[PDB]
Amino acid sequence: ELLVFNFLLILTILTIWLFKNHRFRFLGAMVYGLIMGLILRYILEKMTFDPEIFFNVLLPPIIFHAGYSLKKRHFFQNLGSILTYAFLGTAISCIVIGLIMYGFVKAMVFHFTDCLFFGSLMSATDPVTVLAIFHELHVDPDLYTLLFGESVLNDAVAIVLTYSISIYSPAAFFQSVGNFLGIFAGSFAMGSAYAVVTALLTKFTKLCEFPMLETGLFFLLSWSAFLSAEAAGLTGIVAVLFCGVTQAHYTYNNLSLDSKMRTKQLFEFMNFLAENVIFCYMGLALFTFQNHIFNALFILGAFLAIFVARACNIYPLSFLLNLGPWNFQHMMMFSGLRGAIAFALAIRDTESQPKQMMFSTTLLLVFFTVWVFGGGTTGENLYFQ
Amino acid sequence: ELLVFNFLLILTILTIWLFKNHRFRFLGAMVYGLIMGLILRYILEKMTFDPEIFFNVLLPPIIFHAGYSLKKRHFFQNLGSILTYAFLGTAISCIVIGLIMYGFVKAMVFHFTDCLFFGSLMSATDPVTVLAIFHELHVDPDLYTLLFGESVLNDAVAIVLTYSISIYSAAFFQSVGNFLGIFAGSFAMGSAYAVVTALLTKFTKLCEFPMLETGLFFLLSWSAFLSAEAAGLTGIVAVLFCGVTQAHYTYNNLSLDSKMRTKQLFEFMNFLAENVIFCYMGLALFTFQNHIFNALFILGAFLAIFVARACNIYPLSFLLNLGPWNFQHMMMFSGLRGAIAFALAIRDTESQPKQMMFSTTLLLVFFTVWVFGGGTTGENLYFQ
């Protein structure tokens, strides 16, 4: 694994250079999915040293900046809608299984347990490209906050919800519900406890006179909450650190006054390496030869179902919210990408079932298809408002 | 392994507490490492998993800040004096081998090639505690910049030199060329990436994109370390140290925004050097197969400790007087032993079943020298 890491960096200068050079083009690392892969089709196994378990420990730093960048402009404005969109994860899962179940059934003119697994897997929605486009336009703040809040909550629900399905074993349905509620409640309680401990430590003790000591303690205490989840056996490790929203609510504002900018720059740099996760999408598309061995003709069943499922649970959910404004226009815009986190779930143990491989293959084509919406976003923005 | 890192953080949290309490204490974090091991001793192998190759990849962030923190106030006034201490690593190894050679021969009442490894390894000296004292007191700026000079340079020299004599087996001539060739190639390739970084930020306008140039600087600097290892050029730690020219040119050209961020970001990882400071007791209490020897050869090495830092600086610095120094800084150079020398002793730590004595001996050296470092303010007032 000597020069394997070098290839990750070497291509990344090109990714950095693409953003600066192609700043005004019609339309960064996602472009290399087609051209770059074929040249190396002939080190392939080593470029695959990528360990799934270690993929779920470099993601929490990505999640932390998402929860550390809240502007507190939606806690009393659109928080209720976001909490209403917590049921969207259940809504997407129960509707995706509605159509995809008939998909492979009509293929033969195998169990239902993995059908639920795919539905909960696809529920993640992280339109980072759309959010970046909205931010640079510095417009529609109401849509900016509401969409961003929905994007960081469903994936947190998705990771917790899919685990209970994987351990479903009959009745025993309430056992899976208890595991879902227990893990999610435990993740929030213990995860926020470390943030509270960090907040109270810097609220009374006059440690703010040492900018590095508070900076180092802040990173260690925040990372300890994520680490403690695996030690105690409580799963949802991604959701544990995501609950550090209260960390930016109390610890940031209490007495820092110097590391306020330092915390962002140190942590956004970790989030600035999100192209590595972006690069990993195409990496498993060709390097992991066995992963995409099937590429079966089940795409059309998932292609039609993945958009109609989102279509049939955005307006009805917003219709209920409208009973108790919203411009009646934002629901069309809502339908963005299909989740950055989503890829990691499809690579869980990678061969548990014969169809476990083809879920990743279907997900790979999703990333190669839905990303055109990110490019066709400026035109869509001016189309409506 | 999931909960192994968790126990490292809690003891690392207490390090911040110790440095918080010590504003006026007579005086270090070196205490909790010993205390933590006793609790677990009275989980063992899992705590000290610590892959040997993985120690050399968490080390470069420590070296990078040292080369990036230069005040550019020494290359014009004491550059020659500091470069004269490039032979100090060899000069220390010239006399350390002599005493250690008689240490086991007289005790016996292996071969001398192992003495070379111990002498080259011992030449490292990074008295980070000494620099912290001078900075807080804000005194002796000439002494502060001179001490920082050889302290960080010889660490790279020790790592590159010990490899040549480790494979050395007349045959001594090409070992020097191997040592010189790697060191020469480290400066070329190591500064090659720095030149590329410098020219990119001076011609193309990256000043308007501060969110992007910070990643570019980190990626290019890191790639210098990765390229050296992959290409087969050893002394990869020295290769990243050859990026000292980034602070000379890249840091000053057109950043104007990330100047502070680049310093803080890399210095933040250097603040995580307590893990290196804490990996001693992790291996000094839990690795029962490693440190169980603790042979009665410490006195032979301990006598070599003081004379190594005396038989060289007093003669060599006398030569520099030919072309003041007040004769107080002359004796002050006998500082600490640093923290980089640990990794050279753990190079798979299994060359021979009985030769692992050097790993045992080095661990006691850190404890013995640390208490000497604690009583540094007393020597500061006695001399100056």
Tab-separated table of N, CA and C in Angstrom, chain A residues 1-3 5-10 12-13 15-17 19-21 23 53 194 201 205-208 210 212-217 219-221 223-224 227-231 258 261-262 264-266 268-269 272-273, chain B residues 1-3 5-6 8-9 12-17 19-20 23 193 200 204-206 209 211-216 218-224 226-227 229-231 257-258 260-262 264-265 267-269 271-272:
chain	number	residue	atom	x	y	z
A	1	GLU	N	0.836	-1.194	0.000
A	1	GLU	CA	0.000	0.000	0.000
A	1	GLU	C	0.876	1.250	0.000
A	2	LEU	N	2.000	1.174	-0.714
A	2	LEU	CA	2.943	2.288	-0.748
A	2	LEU	C	2.449	3.403	-1.663
A	3	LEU	N	2.321	3.113	-2.957
A	3	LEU	CA	1.937	4.108	-3.950
A	3	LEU	C	0.432	4.183	-4.170
A	5	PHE	N	-1.812	5.178	-1.983
A	5	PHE	CA	-2.224	6.468	-1.447
A	5	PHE	C	-1.803	7.615	-2.357
A	6	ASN	N	-0.664	7.476	-3.041
A	6	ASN	CA	-0.185	8.542	-3.915
A	6	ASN	C	-1.169	8.820	-5.045
A	7	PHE	N	-1.799	7.773	-5.583
A	7	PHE	CA	-2.748	7.966	-6.675
A	7	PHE	C	-3.985	8.731	-6.220
A	8	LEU	N	-4.393	8.565	-4.959
A	8	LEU	CA	-5.504	9.351	-4.433
A	8	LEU	C	-5.161	10.835	-4.415
A	9	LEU	N	-3.956	11.173	-3.956
A	9	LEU	CA	-3.537	12.569	-3.940
A	9	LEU	C	-3.316	13.100	-5.352
A	10	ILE	N	-2.577	12.353	-6.179
A	10	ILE	CA	-2.133	12.872	-7.474
A	10	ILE	C	-3.322	13.297	-8.327
A	12	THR	N	-6.105	14.221	-7.166
A	12	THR	CA	-6.882	15.233	-6.457
A	12	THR	C	-6.430	16.649	-6.806
A	13	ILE	N	-5.141	16.847	-7.113
A	13	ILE	CA	-4.703	18.147	-7.623
A	13	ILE	C	-5.471	18.502	-8.889
A	15	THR	N	-8.499	17.453	-9.529
A	15	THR	CA	-9.831	17.804	-9.045
A	15	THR	C	-9.862	19.226	-8.498
A	16	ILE	N	-8.838	19.607	-7.731
A	16	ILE	CA	-8.747	20.979	-7.238
A	16	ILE	C	-8.575	21.950	-8.400
A	17	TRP	N	-7.746	21.581	-9.380
A	17	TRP	CA	-7.514	22.460	-10.522
A	17	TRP	C	-8.757	22.593	-11.394
A	19	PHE	N	-11.897	22.712	-10.430
A	19	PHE	CA	-12.837	23.658	-9.838
A	19	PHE	C	-12.439	25.099	-10.136
A	20	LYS	N	-11.148	25.415	-10.023
A	20	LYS	CA	-10.701	26.783	-10.265
A	20	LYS	C	-10.750	27.129	-11.748
A	21	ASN	N	-10.241	26.238	-12.603
A	21	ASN	CA	-10.230	26.511	-14.037
A	21	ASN	C	-11.642	26.512	-14.613
A	23	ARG	N	-14.572	27.173	-13.439
A	23	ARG	CA	-15.453	27.803	-12.461
A	23	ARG	C	-16.748	28.310	-13.083
A	53	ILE	N	-15.025	-1.564	6.911
A	53	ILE	CA	-15.065	-1.137	8.305
A	53	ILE	C	-14.375	0.209	8.476
A	194	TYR	N	-21.417	13.929	25.495
A	194	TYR	CA	-20.043	14.391	25.316
A	194	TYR	C	-20.004	15.866	24.940
A	201	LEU	N	-17.298	22.179	30.446
A	201	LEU	CA	-15.882	22.287	30.788
A	201	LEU	C	-15.318	23.642	30.379
A	205	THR	N	-14.438	26.897	33.560
A	205	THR	CA	-12.988	26.992	33.657
A	205	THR	C	-12.447	27.988	32.638
A	206	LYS	N	-11.482	28.800	33.070
A	206	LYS	CA	-10.883	29.824	32.214
A	206	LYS	C	-9.754	29.227	31.370
A	207	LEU	N	-10.128	28.249	30.546
A	207	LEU	CA	-9.193	27.586	29.648
A	207	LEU	C	-9.110	28.267	28.287
A	208	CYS	N	-9.981	29.241	28.018
A	208	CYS	CA	-10.027	29.908	26.722
A	208	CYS	C	-8.784	30.737	26.428
A	210	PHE	N	-5.865	29.678	26.208
A	210	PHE	CA	-4.937	28.826	25.466
A	210	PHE	C	-5.656	28.322	24.221
A	212	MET	N	-4.834	26.623	21.549
A	212	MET	CA	-4.603	25.258	21.089
A	212	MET	C	-5.201	24.240	22.052
A	213	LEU	N	-5.092	24.491	23.361
A	213	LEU	CA	-5.580	23.523	24.340
A	213	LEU	C	-7.078	23.289	24.191
A	214	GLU	N	-7.850	24.356	23.973
A	214	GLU	CA	-9.274	24.181	23.712
A	214	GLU	C	-9.521	23.539	22.353
A	215	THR	N	-8.674	23.834	21.363
A	215	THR	CA	-8.834	23.236	20.041
A	215	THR	C	-8.565	21.737	20.078
A	216	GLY	N	-7.474	21.330	20.729
A	216	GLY	CA	-7.176	19.911	20.835
A	216	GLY	C	-8.195	19.159	21.668
A	217	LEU	N	-8.638	19.761	22.775
A	217	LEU	CA	-9.650	19.127	23.612
A	217	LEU	C	-10.977	18.995	22.874
A	219	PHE	N	-11.510	18.586	19.616
A	219	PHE	CA	-11.448	17.479	18.667
A	219	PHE	C	-11.453	16.135	19.382
A	220	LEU	N	-10.694	16.017	20.475
A	220	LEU	CA	-10.625	14.750	21.197
A	220	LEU	C	-11.968	14.388	21.820
A	221	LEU	N	-12.633	15.357	22.454
A	221	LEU	CA	-13.921	15.078	23.083
A	221	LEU	C	-14.981	14.721	22.048
A	223	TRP	N	-14.434	13.398	19.029
A	223	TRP	CA	-14.109	12.096	18.457
A	223	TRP	C	-14.330	10.971	19.460
A	224	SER	N	-14.258	11.274	20.759
A	224	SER	CA	-14.482	10.249	21.774
A	224	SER	C	-15.915	9.735	21.738
A	227	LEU	N	-16.107	7.255	19.023
A	227	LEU	CA	-15.343	6.059	19.363
A	227	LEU	C	-16.059	5.217	20.413
A	228	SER	N	-16.728	5.866	21.369
A	228	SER	CA	-17.380	5.142	22.454
A	228	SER	C	-18.544	4.285	21.976
A	229	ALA	N	-19.140	4.610	20.827
A	229	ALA	CA	-20.268	3.829	20.328
A	229	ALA	C	-19.851	2.397	20.012
A	230	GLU	N	-18.705	2.231	19.347
A	230	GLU	CA	-18.219	0.890	19.038
A	230	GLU	C	-17.774	0.157	20.297
A	231	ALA	N	-17.173	0.878	21.247
A	231	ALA	CA	-16.708	0.246	22.478
A	231	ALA	C	-17.869	-0.325	23.283
A	258	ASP	N	-11.803	32.714	20.088
A	258	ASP	CA	-10.643	32.625	19.210
A	258	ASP	C	-10.730	31.440	18.266
A	261	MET	N	-13.395	30.439	14.505
A	261	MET	CA	-13.014	30.201	13.118
A	261	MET	C	-12.117	28.974	12.991
A	262	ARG	N	-11.279	28.712	13.999
A	262	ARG	CA	-10.345	27.592	13.917
A	262	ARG	C	-11.079	26.257	13.869
A	264	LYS	N	-14.023	25.588	12.505
A	264	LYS	CA	-14.526	25.365	11.152
A	264	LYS	C	-13.404	24.966	10.204
A	265	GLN	N	-12.331	25.764	10.157
A	265	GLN	CA	-11.260	25.521	9.192
A	265	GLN	C	-10.603	24.166	9.420
A	266	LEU	N	-10.402	23.788	10.683
A	266	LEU	CA	-9.844	22.473	10.977
A	266	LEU	C	-10.795	21.361	10.552
A	268	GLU	N	-13.696	21.689	8.413
A	268	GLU	CA	-14.108	21.709	7.012
A	268	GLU	C	-13.023	21.134	6.113
A	269	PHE	N	-11.762	21.202	6.548
A	269	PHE	CA	-10.687	20.555	5.806
A	269	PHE	C	-10.889	19.047	5.762
A	272	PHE	N	-13.411	18.845	3.444
A	272	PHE	CA	-12.853	19.189	2.141
A	272	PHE	C	-12.281	17.975	1.421
A	273	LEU	N	-12.054	16.873	2.136
A	273	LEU	CA	-11.607	15.624	1.539
A	273	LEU	C	-12.765	14.726	1.127
B	1	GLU	N	-9.938	-3.965	19.077
B	1	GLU	CA	-9.250	-2.795	18.545
B	1	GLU	C	-10.184	-1.589	18.511
B	2	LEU	N	-11.492	-1.856	18.569
B	2	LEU	CA	-12.471	-0.773	18.556
B	2	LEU	C	-12.339	0.111	19.790
B	3	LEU	N	-12.167	-0.496	20.962
B	3	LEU	CA	-12.071	0.237	22.217
B	3	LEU	C	-10.637	0.579	22.601
B	5	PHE	N	-8.472	2.566	20.950
B	5	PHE	CA	-8.265	3.998	20.770
B	5	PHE	C	-9.014	4.814	21.817
B	6	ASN	N	-10.135	4.294	22.326
B	6	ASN	CA	-10.911	5.032	23.318
B	6	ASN	C	-10.099	5.270	24.586
B	8	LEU	N	-6.946	5.555	24.700
B	8	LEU	CA	-5.893	6.518	24.395
B	8	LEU	C	-6.387	7.953	24.519
B	9	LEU	N	-7.653	8.207	24.174
B	9	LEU	CA	-8.167	9.572	24.206
B	9	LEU	C	-8.329	10.083	25.634
B	12	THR	N	-5.262	11.083	26.954
B	12	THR	CA	-4.844	12.266	26.207
B	12	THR	C	-5.610	13.505	26.655
B	13	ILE	N	-6.856	13.332	27.103
B	13	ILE	CA	-7.612	14.453	27.658
B	13	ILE	C	-6.929	14.984	28.912
B	14	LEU	N	-6.456	14.082	29.776
B	14	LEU	CA	-5.775	14.499	30.996
B	14	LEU	C	-4.473	15.235	30.709
B	15	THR	N	-3.884	15.036	29.526
B	15	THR	CA	-2.698	15.798	29.152
B	15	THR	C	-3.011	17.286	29.053
B	16	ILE	N	-4.149	17.630	28.446
B	16	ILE	CA	-4.571	19.027	28.383
B	16	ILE	C	-4.799	19.574	29.786
B	17	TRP	N	-5.347	18.745	30.676
B	17	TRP	CA	-5.557	19.167	32.057
B	17	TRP	C	-4.234	19.468	32.753
B	19	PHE	N	-1.330	20.367	31.357
B	19	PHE	CA	-0.777	21.601	30.811
B	19	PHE	C	-1.610	22.818	31.184
B	20	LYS	N	-2.881	22.621	31.533
B	20	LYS	CA	-3.688	23.718	32.052
B	20	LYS	C	-3.277	24.088	33.471
B	23	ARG	N	0.690	26.439	35.186
B	23	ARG	CA	1.120	27.798	34.874
B	23	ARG	C	2.249	28.260	35.787
B	193	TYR	N	8.733	19.055	-5.084
B	193	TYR	CA	7.316	19.322	-4.868
B	193	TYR	C	7.095	20.709	-4.278
B	200	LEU	N	3.073	27.401	-8.593
B	200	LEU	CA	1.638	27.376	-8.862
B	200	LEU	C	0.924	28.544	-8.192
B	204	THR	N	-0.418	31.548	-11.132
B	204	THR	CA	-1.870	31.464	-11.143
B	204	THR	C	-2.445	32.097	-9.882
B	205	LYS	N	-3.570	32.792	-10.041
B	205	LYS	CA	-4.162	33.583	-8.963
B	205	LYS	C	-5.001	32.675	-8.070
B	206	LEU	N	-4.360	32.112	-7.048
B	206	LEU	CA	-5.049	31.340	-6.023
B	206	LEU	C	-5.399	32.169	-4.795
B	209	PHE	N	-9.110	32.261	-4.095
B	209	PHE	CA	-9.696	30.963	-3.762
B	209	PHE	C	-8.941	30.387	-2.570
B	211	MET	N	-10.147	28.715	-0.095
B	211	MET	CA	-10.674	27.417	0.306
B	211	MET	C	-10.013	26.273	-0.450
B	212	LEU	N	-9.375	26.562	-1.583
B	212	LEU	CA	-8.804	25.546	-2.457
B	212	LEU	C	-7.295	25.407	-2.312
B	213	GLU	N	-6.577	26.517	-2.115
B	213	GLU	CA	-5.119	26.457	-2.070
B	213	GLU	C	-4.616	25.735	-0.826
B	214	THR	N	-5.374	25.777	0.272
B	214	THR	CA	-4.959	25.075	1.484
B	214	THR	C	-4.892	23.571	1.244
B	215	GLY	N	-5.909	23.018	0.582
B	215	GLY	CA	-5.859	21.611	0.222
B	215	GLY	C	-4.731	21.304	-0.743
B	216	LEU	N	-4.495	22.203	-1.702
B	216	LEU	CA	-3.423	21.996	-2.670
B	216	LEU	C	-2.062	21.942	-1.989
B	218	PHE	N	-1.443	21.141	1.190
B	218	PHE	CA	-1.379	19.908	1.970
B	218	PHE	C	-1.192	18.691	1.071
B	219	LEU	N	-1.915	18.639	-0.050
B	219	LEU	CA	-1.815	17.491	-0.945
B	219	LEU	C	-0.425	17.387	-1.561
B	220	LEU	N	0.123	18.512	-2.025
B	220	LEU	CA	1.443	18.491	-2.646
B	220	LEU	C	2.529	18.156	-1.630
B	221	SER	N	2.429	18.708	-0.419
B	221	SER	CA	3.412	18.403	0.617
B	221	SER	C	3.349	16.936	1.025
B	222	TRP	N	2.138	16.399	1.192
B	222	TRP	CA	1.993	14.993	1.561
B	222	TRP	C	2.494	14.084	0.443
B	223	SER	N	2.205	14.440	-0.813
B	223	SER	CA	2.612	13.601	-1.937
B	223	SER	C	4.127	13.464	-2.025
B	224	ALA	N	4.871	14.444	-1.505
B	224	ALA	CA	6.324	14.324	-1.471
B	224	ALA	C	6.755	13.152	-0.600
B	226	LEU	N	4.814	10.496	0.079
B	226	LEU	CA	4.341	9.269	-0.554
B	226	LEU	C	5.215	8.877	-1.740
B	227	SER	N	5.665	9.860	-2.523
B	227	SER	CA	6.470	9.560	-3.704
B	227	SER	C	7.811	8.941	-3.327
B	229	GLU	N	8.716	7.100	-0.700
B	229	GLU	CA	8.598	5.712	-0.267
B	229	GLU	C	8.310	4.803	-1.457
B	230	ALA	N	7.358	5.199	-2.305
B	230	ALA	CA	6.986	4.374	-3.450
B	230	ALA	C	8.147	4.210	-4.423
B	231	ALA	N	8.910	5.280	-4.652
B	231	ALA	CA	10.037	5.219	-5.575
B	231	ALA	C	11.203	4.406	-5.031
B	257	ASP	N	-4.235	34.811	3.018
B	257	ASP	CA	-5.372	34.383	3.822
B	257	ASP	C	-5.084	33.101	4.585
B	258	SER	N	-4.568	32.080	3.904
B	258	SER	CA	-4.277	30.790	4.513
B	258	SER	C	-2.945	30.771	5.249
B	260	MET	N	-2.115	31.925	8.161
B	260	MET	CA	-2.338	31.454	9.523
B	260	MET	C	-2.949	30.057	9.535
B	261	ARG	N	-3.868	29.773	8.607
B	261	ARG	CA	-4.515	28.464	8.587
B	261	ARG	C	-3.516	27.351	8.297
B	262	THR	N	-2.605	27.578	7.349
B	262	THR	CA	-1.597	26.568	7.039
B	262	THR	C	-0.713	26.289	8.248
B	264	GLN	N	-1.534	26.791	11.526
B	264	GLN	CA	-2.314	26.147	12.580
B	264	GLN	C	-2.666	24.706	12.224
B	265	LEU	N	-3.007	24.445	10.960
B	265	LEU	CA	-3.455	23.109	10.574
B	265	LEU	C	-2.354	22.077	10.796
B	267	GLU	N	0.462	22.540	12.598
B	267	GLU	CA	0.856	22.563	14.003
B	267	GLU	C	-0.145	21.811	14.871
B	268	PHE	N	-1.411	21.751	14.448
B	268	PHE	CA	-2.403	20.989	15.199
B	268	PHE	C	-2.046	19.508	15.236
B	269	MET	N	-1.604	18.953	14.104
B	269	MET	CA	-1.163	17.563	14.104
B	269	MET	C	0.111	17.380	14.917
B	271	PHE	N	0.674	18.993	17.612
B	271	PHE	CA	0.193	18.939	18.986
B	271	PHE	C	-0.231	17.531	19.384
B	272	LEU	N	-0.470	16.652	18.410
B	272	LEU	CA	-0.777	15.253	18.669
B	272	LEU	C	0.478	14.405	18.846
